[PDB]
Amino acid sequence: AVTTVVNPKYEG
Amino acid sequence: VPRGSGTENLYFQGHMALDGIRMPDGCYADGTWELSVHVTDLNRDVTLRVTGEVHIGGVMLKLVEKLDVKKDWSDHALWWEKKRTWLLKTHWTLDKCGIQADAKLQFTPQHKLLRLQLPNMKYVKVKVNFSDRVFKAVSDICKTFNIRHPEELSLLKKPRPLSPPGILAVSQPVTSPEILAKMFKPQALLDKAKTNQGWLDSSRSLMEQDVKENEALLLRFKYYSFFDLNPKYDAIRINQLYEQAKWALLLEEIECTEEEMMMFAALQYHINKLSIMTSENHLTTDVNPECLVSPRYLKKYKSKQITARILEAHQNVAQMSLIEAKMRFIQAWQSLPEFGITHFIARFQGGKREELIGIAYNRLIRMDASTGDAIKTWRFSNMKQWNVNWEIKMVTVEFADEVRLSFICTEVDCKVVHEFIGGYIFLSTRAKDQNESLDEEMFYKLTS
Amino acid sequence: GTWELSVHVTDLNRDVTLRVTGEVHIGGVMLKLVEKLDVKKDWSDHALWWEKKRTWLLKTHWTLDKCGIQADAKLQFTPQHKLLRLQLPNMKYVKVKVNFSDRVFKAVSDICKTFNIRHPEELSLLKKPPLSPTSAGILAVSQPVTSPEILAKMFKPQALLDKAKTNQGWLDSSRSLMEQDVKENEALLLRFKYYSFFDLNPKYDAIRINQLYEQAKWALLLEEIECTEEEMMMFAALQYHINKLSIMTSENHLTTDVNPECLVSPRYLKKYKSKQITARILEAHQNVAQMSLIEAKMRFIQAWQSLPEFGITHFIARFQGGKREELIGIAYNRLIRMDASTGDAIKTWRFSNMKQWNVNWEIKMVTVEFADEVRLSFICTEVDCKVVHEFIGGYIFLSTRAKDQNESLDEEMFYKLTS
């Protein structure tokens, strides 16, 4: 699988 | 193909009725079977008769019944080496945990002794819970040490004492010209980068990460972004950061020019003089109260009573100068052009050889693995998201103002890199107007 | 038709009489004096002074008629630049060459340039009831008291009313030293006058910081400002520490314990003789020790700035509706009506509120109008009336210093606010 982590600076 | 207990290929067919078409596999005439448990405290093995319906807490009680009925077993828990997991959900049945007669469990204190090498190079021993996530264990160790903002620190395995109150304030120079040279490991950049494979996983426990009981780990500042570093109450935190900076320069973990080295050396020499000043005794002929206080105090007190009050106040004054000088050393170190970069080995897409990914508080850097020369920099402020493909061990970073960045690391390096990026992103959300509102839930969501 | 004019040449203690008309120019009188006295000597610093009228005759294009000079006018012909003794905040005396005809605001600015003290508008000259620096060591001097016989012969156990009277001696910044009864070879005090210090920067204000530290130090030793016994002991320990740091800046190559093998990475030992490394460290240590010394002086200054009585300059005043003499206290942000016996603050008005303000010079009454509070009015003596006026205008002028505009000192703006 993959672990996608979004920079809170952008969404969430 | 993984075999045995706790896998998809168990050695015994479980859930067999005593009165089925034939007796259950590997069971005694009464339907029980033997679970062998190693009690680390006593270096002894103990066997229990159980079935699959017995609860984890049932196993623990059966063990305690067989061992000393007066001894304190309240700290012991079951550890399952093969599956690298503690068994703390005590209401689970052996069948739920996948536990058959082949399983080798340990009954062992959750709290153990752990040797730490501090940044000032001294060894301490602490009692820490080996079943807590390392994030919490580090936070608890820093509280014992009165070091604020534990999220900037972590634990690092040494590359291939004393039991806490005052060795944390120790700040002395190397003993010999040859004790210093003995510690100097003439290391290339790639070999420094390999050291960074030893940063512990903050989301897992010490037990799950191959830490012997009397193995020394390094307690180190991990993230080079120091929030509210305040001389008025961070004396210990400042001393340990200064010591980390002092050794990194003496040992060439970070380079500087010759003129900078002579400045850091004078500043270290000065700090050592100020430290002698905070403990110089028989401070007698120096203090002349007639020159230091207004004449009304002279007439109201005996000189040797004023001299005493002055020398008591001077202790705090000298400690402040000492802390300010260390702050200045840290600030000069922070201004070095490669400060704050942690290097990892990485193969960049379309690249010819192994290079480095450098991670800093505000950016990622592609660097040459021999010289450390920066090739390309990406700012976190332009980063939209990032992901790890754990199949091919590939990190991919997406941006708003250019095409994605992709690189390959070893499996160990993938986990560490992912936590560094997530960690620095977490630290960037710390706000001045705040209390110790360390959102633990947010750090875990970004680094796992 | 000519009439005679008595001009005294201070430079030669000789009196010279001149026949003049009245349509003659001031510049004309000057050239006649140069014809009668030495034709070789340099007279270009000399100007005409009129001691009876307390004024310089520095307009050469003007006529004797435009000046009201008649035959009853005894003038002087005298060097503008004269020797002036100064006691610095560190209590040391220096001599200086200053234009006794410039307005004192300009004299102070030029002295501070000579001494390398930035922001001269915070300093001024005060009358008390010697190396001779000229513009291109004594200003970085910070020595403890000589003996308990020197600190006690300096101590004046004076009440609060008496300190308020020393403030009569602040010079008019809009007038020259000559107009203010300052003799050559006589000592004025150079002091920080205003307690609002703009950009006090340890990176380059070493001298200005040293002198401000010394002023605070002495004010505390001489009880000109009071603090608690706990604070006095902290200040004493801090002064003791500063004197230790000061000694550390003179660490020579024979008293030194620098061990390079403990302070530098091994490649330096393998490349340089030990003596070369220590000399490099000792040279770098000078700036390092001087920086610790400056920071410690900054901490002393910052503790002094936090005292309850800090930064207040007192004057004797009769407030409207008051029954006796009290004190008007002037600080950088506020005006305080104070009891002259206890020093207690009775009422405080903030400069932020101050709409406008005027001085009735007939009855010597200062009046300050506010937006929230009712008018404040008080009467002072005639001298104290001029000094208080300058203090209020001066502090307003200092507040206008744009927090970071690095602008030139608006000299003309100052003069408008204090005249």
Author numbering:
A (entry chain C): 786 to 797
B (entry chain A): -14 to 145, 200 to 203, 218 to 336, 513 to 677
C (entry chain B): 16 to 144, 200 to 206, 219 to 336, 513 to 677
Text taken from the publication that reported this structure:
Integrins are heterodimeric transmembrane receptors composed of alpha (α) and beta (β) subunits that link extracellular ligands to the actin cytoskeleton through intracellular adaptors. Cytoplasmic adapter proteins including KINDLIN2, Integrin-β1 binding protein 1 (ICAP1) and to a lesser extend FilaminA were shown to bind the Integrin-β1 peptide in the proximity of the K794-containing distal NPXY-motif. Structural analysis of Integrin-β1 interaction with KINDLIN2, biochemical pulldown assay, and binding energy determination by using molecular dynamics simulation showed that acetylation of K794 and the K794Q-mutant increased KINDLIN2 binding affinity to the Integrin-β1.
To elucidate the structural basis of the enhanced binding of KINDLIN2 with either acetylated Integrin-β1 or its mimetic mutations, we attempted the co-crystallization of mouse Kindlin2 with a free mouse Integrin-β1 peptide bearing an acetylated K794 (AcK794) residue. Despite previous unsuccessful attempts when co-crystallizing Kindlin2 with wildtype Integrin-peptides, this strategy resulted in co-crystals of Kindlin2 and the acetylated Integrin-β1 peptide that diffracted to 2.04 Å. This is consistent with the enhanced interaction with Kindlin2 when K794 is acetylated in the Integrin-β1 peptide. The structure reveals that acetylated K794 of Integrin-β1 is making close contacts with the β4-β5 loop and α1 of the F3 domain of Kindlin2. Moreover, the C-terminal end of the Integrin-peptide curls upwards, owing to a lateral shift of the acetyl-lysine side chain, and repositioning of the succeeding Tyr795-side chain anchorage to Kindlin2 as a result. In addition, proximity analysis confirms that the Acetyl-K794 side chain makes contacts with side chains of F609 and S657, and the backbone of S610. The surface representation of Kindlin2 indicated that the β1-K794Q peptide is bound closer to the Kindlin2 F3 subdomain than the wildtype β1 peptide, and that the β1-AcK794 peptide fits the Integrin binding groove of Kindlin2 more snugly than the wildtype peptide.
